[PDB]
């Protein structure tokens, strides 16, 4: 309940409905309203939906909110490319230490071009590298349309979180998206494994590439 | 018209402070309670806190409570966010943004509203100037596929930004790619620059990247080959 869910991103092509959920909890959607804001690039985020169910002026008449029980949902009709944007849902909380509440954010994306899936090179750590006593593994992701990625990395066959950092999917001059995420171990972790594993998934696909010590 | 104009923003040191400040325009501010919501570059936003039209009830995100002090004075029309006890995560653009209606009632509570400002950016660190140090990402034939190979170079643990990377001085730009450098939770900066290369040059050509970090005046190039 600290962030209302959403679902990361969600896509739809021109003329198509989508809808976004936002999932909560009887003490924030259960009792108050739900508001959406709208973010474009760089930009602050604007009002869309208020009161549930209602628009400023200046918000067409394709966006609209509804609600049941716990959850909240923003429709868009008829899509149109400038609806290309991050909708964030918010309501306030009355919970021991209440507070207004966002939502994660969904990255929508309006399809103009072809979906493309993540090129991923994955590079060990180098000589240089484990001699300085570090380890870094490199997992670069690039091509990607649309621009929404999941990373996870394995250790053999199982989950690694810790010293993860990947970055937020930027635009590449193509339009389409890059990012890159780096597994930071020890040597001694590196070469106690027989192999480690970035898997991107992308629209439901997942990428998978794999190293091992030499 | 109606408007917000948030100043205040720059770079400081955690245990340190900053104050903010949000002038309104054009509609009016003293009857309106007024937020400050904030957003960590390329992730969502996060509310702060807000204040009653009158000042006297304030409320805070948990993770500020004890460090930020938000409070107004209506008749300059001016918000502020009083900073601190500055962290690290406490690096965002931060928004005002006024309440949605000018009373308060039961079943709304309170919730940012149709006017925000434009944001002003906190960045808050405690690093220093470093040059890179760089790692060259050998060609292998798990980086080779259809004829072309990747290589590529890491530029680990600079600031602040940017790094630029050439690859042989400029004469190899087809197939190079400089991706965008992640934040480390140590504050520090890296990034890698990777480029296709048909398979049939790694042993006649020879690929060097040449890095260079202004703000510490380093410049490094390192030739990247083939393991041994």
């Known amino acids: 309940q600290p962030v209302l869910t959403q679902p990361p991103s969600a896509s739809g092509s021109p003329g198509q409905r989508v809808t976004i959920s936002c999932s909560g909890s009887?003490?924030?959607?259960?009792?108050?309203?739900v508001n959406w804001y709208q973010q474009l690039p760089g930009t602050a985020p604007k009002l869309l939906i208020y009161s549930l169910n209602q628009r400023p002026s200046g918000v067409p008449d394709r966006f609209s909110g509804s609600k049941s029980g716990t959850s909240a949902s923003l429709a868009i009709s008829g899509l149109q490319s400038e609806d290309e944007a991050v909708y964030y849902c918010?309501?306030?909380?009355?919970?021991?230490?209440?507070?207004?509440?966002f939502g994660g954010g969904t990255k929508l994306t309006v399809l103009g071009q072809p979906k493309a899936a993540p090129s991923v090179t994955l590079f060990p750590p180098s000589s240089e590298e484990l001699q300085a006593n570090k380890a870094t593994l490199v997992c670069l992701i690039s091509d990607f349309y649309p621009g929404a990625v999941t990373v996870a990395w394995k250790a053999d066959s199982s989950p690694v979180k810790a010293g993860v950092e990947t970055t937020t999917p930027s635009k590449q001059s193509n339009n389409k998206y890059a990012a890159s995420s780096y597994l930071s171990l020890t040597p001694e972790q590196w070469k106690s494994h027989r192999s480690y594993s970035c898997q991107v998934t992308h629209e439901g696909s997942t990428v998978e590439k794999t190293v091992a010590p030499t | 018209q109606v408007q917000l104009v948030q100043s205040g923003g720059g770079v400081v040191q955690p245990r340190r402070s900053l104050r903010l400040s949000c002038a309104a325009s054009?509609?009016?501010?003293?009857?309106?309670?007024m937020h400050w919501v904030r957003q960590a570059p390329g992730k969502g936003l996060e509310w702060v806190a807000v204040?009653?039209?009158?000042?006297?009830?304030?409320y805070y995100a948990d993770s500020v409570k004890g460090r930020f002090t938000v409070s107004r004075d209506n008749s300059k029309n001016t918000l502020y966010l009083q900073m601190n006890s500055l962290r690290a995560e406490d690096t965002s653009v931060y928004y005002c943004?006024?309440?949605?209606?000018?009373?308060?009632?039961?079943?709304?509570?309170?919730?940012?509203?149709?006017?925000w400002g434009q944001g002003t950016l906190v960045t808050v660190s405690s690093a220093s100037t470093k040059g890179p140090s760089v790692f060259p990402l050998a060609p292998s034939s798990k980086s080779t596929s259809g004829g072309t190979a990747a290589l590529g170079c890491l530029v680990k643990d600079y600031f602040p930004e940017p790094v630029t990377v050439s690859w042989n001085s400029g004469a190899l730009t087809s197939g190079v790619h400089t991706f965008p450098a992640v934040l480390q939770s140590s504050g520090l900066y890296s990034l890698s620059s990777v480029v296709t290369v048909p398979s049939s040059s790694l042993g006649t050509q020879t690929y060097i990247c040449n890095v260079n970090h202004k703000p510490s005046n380093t410049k490094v190039d390192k030739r990247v080959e083939p393991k041994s």
């Open positions: 009887s003490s924030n959607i259960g009792s108050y309203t």
């Open positions: 918010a309501a306030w909380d009355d919970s021991l230490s209440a507070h207004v509440v």
């Open positions: 943004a006024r309440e949605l209606l000018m009373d308060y009632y039961d079943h709304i509570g309170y919730s940012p509203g149709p006017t």
């Open positions: 054009g509609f009016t501010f003293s009857s309106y309670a």
């Open positions: 204040i009653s039209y009158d000042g006297r009830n304030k």
